[PDB]
Design a protein around this ligand. Structure first.
Ligand SMILES: [Zn+2]
Ligand SMILES: [Zn+2]
Length: 178
């Protein structure tokens, strides 16, 4: 297995997947690494298995249909995975913890949102439909773009939103369009 965490790319106390070469810090994996199991398969492997069990799951879907899906175990896992893919980008650090807003000429958002909050909400089974998770994720980037206005720092929200959206389309097999 790899000698660095798949998510944060650092060494440390690592847990190795038994079905692929990836390794993870306990709380870098989502869900947190469940240490009782042996064999243990990571989320990448679990997602691949869902895919292989139901090959037609990879045919194109409409975003509107995907968002209305109830958060049954398969969809819960897909949202956990999509969240993990965002954390895998180093620029997620800007969006991970609770923000605060005090900049001349701007007012903070009415509903602040951050990745660790989404992570807790998933862990606590607070989303009933994929829509709730996707709305909170999109809110993170929208809040950022609105607050930073014309500061070049606004670009960080565009960049991380693009990671989110590319991964959403992949994981939920959104129908390709131009
Ligand atoms: Zn890590
Ligand atoms: Zn694996």
């Amino acid at each position: 297995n790899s000698n660095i965490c798949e998510v944060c790319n650092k060494w440390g106390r690592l847990f190795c997947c038994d079905t692929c070469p990836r390794s993870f810090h306990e709380h870098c994996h989502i869900p947190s690494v469940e240490a009782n199991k042996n064999p243990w398969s990571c989320i990448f492997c679990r997602i691949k298995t869902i895919q292989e069990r139901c090959p037609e799951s990879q045919s194109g879907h409409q975003e509107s249909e995907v968002l209305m899906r109830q958060m049954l175990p398969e969809e819960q896992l897909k949202c956990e995975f999509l969240l993990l893919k965002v954390y895998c980008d180093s620029k997620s650090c800007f969006f991970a913890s609770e923000p605060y807003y005090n900049r001349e000429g701007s007012q903070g958002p009415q509903k602040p949102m951050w990745l660790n909050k989404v992570k807790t909400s998933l862990n606590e089974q607070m989303y009933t439909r994929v829509e709730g998770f996707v709305q909170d994720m999109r809110l993170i980037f929208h809040n950022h773009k609105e607050f930073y206005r014309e500061d070049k720092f606004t670009r960080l929200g565009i960049q991380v939103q693009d990671i989110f959206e590319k991964n959403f389309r992949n994981i939920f097999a959104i129908q390709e369009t131009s």
